[PDB]
Symmetry: C2
Subunit: 86 residues, 2 copies
Amino acid sequence: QLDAIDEDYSQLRKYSCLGQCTIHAHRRASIGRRVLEALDEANKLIEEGRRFKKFGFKPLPKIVDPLPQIKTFGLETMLSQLYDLF
Amino acid sequence: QLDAIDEDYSQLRKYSCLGQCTIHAHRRASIGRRVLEALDEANKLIEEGRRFKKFGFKPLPKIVDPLPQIKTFGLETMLSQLYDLF
């Protein structure tokens, strides 16, 4: 969510007309820490991101494999019988 | 002549209205060096000034010691004679 610090720095850019005024110099510390945290976090994510070589794995086969489901008629009774013996 | 740097710093204080403005920031170096030079020079003069114990010395006796010069009359001729034999 770098957009949040982007808008925050834009809001500071609205009021930081002068470096000398303290009316707004207090929030410079917040920007100074949050920008650095975002920067080194992004660097860590970049270094990790470049390093992956495998991006997927074959999942375990499903409990049941789907089969053609052509519309049936009047099979409910014998299906129930098959379940009964099963 | 500390008055010179005094007036110079007053002239800078006329423009010292804004820290942010840098047009006048160039002369800050000149003030920064001249004030320090005056300060440590003054400190050296103070340390030397406190240390004197003797403040005068008896001069060598003059070639001639003045004597009463009461107004004289008609002594020029014999004064010239005295100079002649002297």
